[PDB]
Symmetry: none
Amino acid sequence: AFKNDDQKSAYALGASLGRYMENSLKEQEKLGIKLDKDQLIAGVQDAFADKSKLSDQEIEQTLQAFEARVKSSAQAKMEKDAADNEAKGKEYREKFAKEKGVKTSSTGLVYQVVEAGKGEAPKDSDTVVVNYKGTLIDGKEFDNSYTRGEPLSFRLDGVIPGWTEGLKNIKKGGKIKLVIPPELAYGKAGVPGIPPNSTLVFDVELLDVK
Amino acid sequence: AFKNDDQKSAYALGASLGRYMENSLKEQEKLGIKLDKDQLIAGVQDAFADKSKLSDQEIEQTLQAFEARVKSSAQAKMEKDAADNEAKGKEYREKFAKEKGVKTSSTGLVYQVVEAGKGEAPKDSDTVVVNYKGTLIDGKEFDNSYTRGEPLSFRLDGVIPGWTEGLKNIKKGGKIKLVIPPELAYGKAGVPGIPPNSTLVFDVELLDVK
């Protein structure tokens, strides 16, 4: 496959560039931007052979415009998503909060104790051990301890406020459903996997409190 | 022949990336590392098509090993340049030192008084004001006060030893050429613009001693 390092390392370096481009295409697709892949590859090949069809100024200006197009799109989408998610989330929480056995805390956390459990009331400095599933209001799973094959262990004050607050509502052996406003979660910015202003739905099983 | 932005921007993006890659190989080349360009393009193509002959894990392992090769090669080049420059400089100094009017000091500084000047001899805690031009033995100018439109002012013992010692051989109004061994200058490490073990040539005019 590879005779020596000048080959293998080259190939690796190249594959890394190829991977980078694919990743870039993926973020662009989120914005409806679908670049011409053949042209993307040809520019790489041409440049690499010192035969670019575009002058240095043209490249620079073209990229400048492109990067502005991308950022402009990205911002409008963030703006729209944020507004839409805040609204849909409020509606969702409002409806759920009315259901049998569901409660709303003074902070806006909405929760449903499924099993109370038994033992000490969890406190901020405790280590809790849990199984859990996290999904968005449309059902999209973004996190899931089961898939890693072990429960998550963490300091109660080391997670999002909705968790820090919610788990205090049960004890060891308990189970609770938490419907958390973005204000007690990842807010407007969100994080990878979690869009701006997302209400999060967690199904949690509290296995240990130590 | 670009018909639209999705074609043109993709090409520019690829070209920018290919140029980045080409420039990287150029730097590697300066260290004796000449990767196989055909394999580099095959890696780009294969990865872009999700058919890389190296898994992500293998790519990373290969690249980490490559980074260490690169740094090892960088250090090798330094050592070689350090040795070569020490030899060339010693040769330059020895020849110059035999010429009429040139002296060698106890420390190995080589110097040529052009004009004695008149007044007090510069002492360690004094401030000196000088015009000078600094060249490597091959003639490459690395510093030239005249171009700054003003002389340089400094405490005599706050600079490289070659200057500290050298300027004591003339007086205000004098001029001296200093041929300074690396040991009395920036030594094996050098500094930006001055390679390892560079003998330095300074044409100096001593304007004031205060």
